[PDB]
Design a binder for this molecule. Sequence first.
Ligand SMILES: O=C1C[C@H](c2ccc(O)c(Cl)c2)Oc2cc(O)cc(O)c21
Ligand SMILES: O=C1C[C@H](c2ccc(O)c(Cl)c2)Oc2cc(O)cc(O)c21
Ligand SMILES: [Ca+2]
Ligand SMILES: [Ca+2]
Ligand SMILES: [Ca+2]
Ligand SMILES: [Ca+2]
Lengths: 115, 115, 115, 115
Amino acid sequence: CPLMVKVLDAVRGSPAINVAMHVFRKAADDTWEPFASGKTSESGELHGLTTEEEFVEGIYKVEIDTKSYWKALGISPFHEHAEVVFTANDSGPRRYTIAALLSPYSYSTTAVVTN
Amino acid sequence: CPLMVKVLDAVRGSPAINVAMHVFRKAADDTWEPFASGKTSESGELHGLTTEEEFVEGIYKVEIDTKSYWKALGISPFHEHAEVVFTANDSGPRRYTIAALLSPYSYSTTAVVTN
Amino acid sequence: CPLMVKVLDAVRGSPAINVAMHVFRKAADDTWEPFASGKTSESGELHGLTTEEEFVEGIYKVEIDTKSYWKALGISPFHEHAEVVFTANDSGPRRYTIAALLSPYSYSTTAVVTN
Amino acid sequence: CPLMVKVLDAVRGSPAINVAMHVFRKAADDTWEPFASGKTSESGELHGLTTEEEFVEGIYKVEIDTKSYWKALGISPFHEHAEVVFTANDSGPRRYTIAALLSPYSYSTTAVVTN
Ligand SMILES: O=C1C[C@H](c2ccc(O)c(Cl)c2)Oc2cc(O)cc(O)c21
Ligand SMILES: O=C1C[C@H](c2ccc(O)c(Cl)c2)Oc2cc(O)cc(O)c21
Ligand SMILES: [Ca+2]
Ligand SMILES: [Ca+2]
Ligand SMILES: [Ca+2]
Ligand SMILES: [Ca+2]
């Protein structure tokens, strides 16, 4: 699993379940092409987005639909979504875990990159 | 000053100085048109991006060039930039302060919305 | 003002107002003696805790009563308080701003140390 | 495993390995009694601190020795340690995951509480 996303809810102290996200990859013409999508599980994790072979060097964007998450909980949040944009595999294949910690008016995101 | 951006550096414990950013407003064709830009001051702040009359309801994106900041410090970063996408809404007088706390592999962003 | 504390609320997108805090200085017998205290203003800030002459090198602890804050808002919190423990060091003129961003089950704290 | 701690390094984008921490439990006389200790593994996690039977209701403090971690990497950080203080099991047994994201001048901590 070369790309995994974990989302946590800082209001409830729980995984953020059923959070939709879309991954894009920058094309040679500088447009964002769709790459993968899914939603987080009961553990707040989304696995299986891509494979080692398909996850080539490039600039990737993970768009996490945080607004829909908060609205379903009755909360009108500040952000439309959380965006994570990064260059991947520029020094060879790596495994990426992208984590997001969500509050209505704030989020934090980190990356753990392993060889 | 209806919109201010403040950027902090979590490695140095300092304002993040000379950080470039661009602000975009979402157009009707779902594209991002440039709206304002600047670089942070010695206090890590960027003021004067817009005026009350110009800052109408809509979806705005603040793109903070964090990669160039870490590059100038000789530190290898994860993100291409930090993106803050939000809806500005008219409900009484509202001033928006977007704050971002930067680390090489993580960032946090919050919004302080006041009257 | 060599020491200022700023507290923000990530659920409401606002300064965290009327948050009590106590500052302690570590004594030679490894106990915490009270040094200063106050409550945050309507801007979420607490100034005037100490003076340049009094704020000598040592280990300091800022205990922020986050539990009482969330209780007053009717929101069940995780932490009893938020603790910030640090060494103040003389290396040129130094002003310390401790910032804390509060959510019910999470907090973030940073230090901005300037001249 | 009713109590687990995970520590991440926001400068390197990696688990924070070999981070020492000590857990204390508040006694009836309001002193902090030692409860458990250990260090994080290669995955940045510390498991096996306690058991369901031993982890009774009470106020617990997790003291994470972040200063020693940064110093071994050549960095002089701001904080002496990261402290996480919380009431546990007040509504019956729960499982607690305490996470800390570390930077030299900042840290974030969250809790995931499961039934
Ligand atoms: O608005 C903020 C929030 C910001 C902040 C952002 C993310 C974080 O995780 C933390 Cl701890 C703190 O700190 C600040 C420092 C400051 O001098 C003035 C400010 O307005 C802020
Ligand atoms: O990987 C992480 C990191 C995440 C996190 C994200 C942003 C943050 O600011 C903080 Cl503190 C923590 O917390 C976690 C909680 C958990 O149960 C299992 C995990 O793997 C993580
Ligand atoms: Ca390459
Ligand atoms: Ca309206
Ligand atoms: Ca000295
Ligand atoms: Ca009870």
